[PDB]
Amino acid sequence: PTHLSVDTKFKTEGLCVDIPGIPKDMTYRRLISMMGFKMNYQVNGYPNMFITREEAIRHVRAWIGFDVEGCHGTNLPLQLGFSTGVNLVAVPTPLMYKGLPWNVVRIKIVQMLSDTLKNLSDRVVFVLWAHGFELTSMKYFVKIGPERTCCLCDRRATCFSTASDTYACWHHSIGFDYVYNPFMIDVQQWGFTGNLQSNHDLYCQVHGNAHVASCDAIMTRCLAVHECFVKRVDWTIEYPIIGDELKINAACRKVQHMVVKAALLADKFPVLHDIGNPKAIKCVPQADVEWKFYDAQPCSDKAYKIEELFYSYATHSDKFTDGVCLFWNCNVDRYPANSIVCRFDTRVLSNLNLPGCDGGSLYVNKHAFHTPAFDKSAFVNLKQLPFFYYSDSPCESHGIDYVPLKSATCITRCNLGGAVCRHHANEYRLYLDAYNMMISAGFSLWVYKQFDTYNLWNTFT
């Protein structure tokens, strides 16, 4: 049960308008043969072009929605749509291109997939709502065979060039003309009633149907993300390291200890309400405060209503108005005024953040997290948290070169005394680096309106 058996049944109802008379009884083996691909009994890492839902979820970074619309059967032109927004027109003689023959269209397909996926994945997963023409068009731009490595590196081969007779990964495929060993999944095989638009619109209002192939390709991948990451959640699935994952995660831990520690020193709240991850540990273990935890899993569909986080049924809830409330990646519709918040901005463009469902995004860093759409109005009772570095640690160096630090946001005894010491200058520069890393990864920081770093200077007396 590792791969999808080629002898598994494939439901053909969705294919019978493009392919009338298609056998109701069909396997992946006969379907693949129909598409013009010869597996010839091969045990070399490519058992099936199609993959299980579990295998697709593990390779969510490789997903590219694909749809083909029949503009006019190898005699009429086809519109090729991709979830990148690209529409190509292939002739057999929202980015829309005019009619060109397959030999030139296939060069553009390789270029587009290579530029989209080189920093995300080792493969491509064509996400379909299969009706017929997309499967029968694959023979015009896809070549299959045994698993291979790139001619210029150790990465698996994803492209093929008929000009040079060589194979390349997404990084070294310039001028390559064929997609080599792609994977695919038909969303219609999951058990849906009704067409694509009707099932998609049930969960998302951000992707309209402008009636082009790329609209369907976007809606297809969106519907798939909703089913695999919104309605169904699995935080036990690990994902490879493709970018600044370790640095971003380390930065969030530094930023959270800093911000929370300074809030408790500046306003001396007697109680802190830590709302969110049921596995959370105190970010400031030495603070005086009564630390009270509240369990709430990451919301992947809609942001939590704040009234439901405080709903206690037939008993009195804890008093949230006493002290401060810490919402570290705990997404709510409207934060209370006495809060410290970290809220991921789903609009951020990065290799970790994939487009999601209903304005939301799929942030993949060790685990996959579908996050609801970022909404500025959640923060009406708060203000943006400004950058500051605080330290009560002694001014001692131990064991890099130097330019003296001058900054109003270095809250240390040395700065109060007139001149930043070398230890606090190094630590400040490191902390600013960690902070900028976290902000550029998409995280946004918010705090109660009375927060004032001027209150931190008297903690040195």
Ligand SMILES: CN1CCN(C(=O)Nc2ccc(F)cc2)CC1
């Ligand atoms: C059995 N109930 C469960 C909910 N509940 C509660 O206390 N919620 C709450 C969360 C965060 C906060 F800050 C205050 C209250 C009351 C007891």
Ligand SMILES: [Zn+2]
């Ligand atoms: Zn390579």
Ligand SMILES: [Zn+2]
């Ligand atoms: Zn959508």
Ligand SMILES: [Zn+2]
């Ligand atoms: Zn110092």
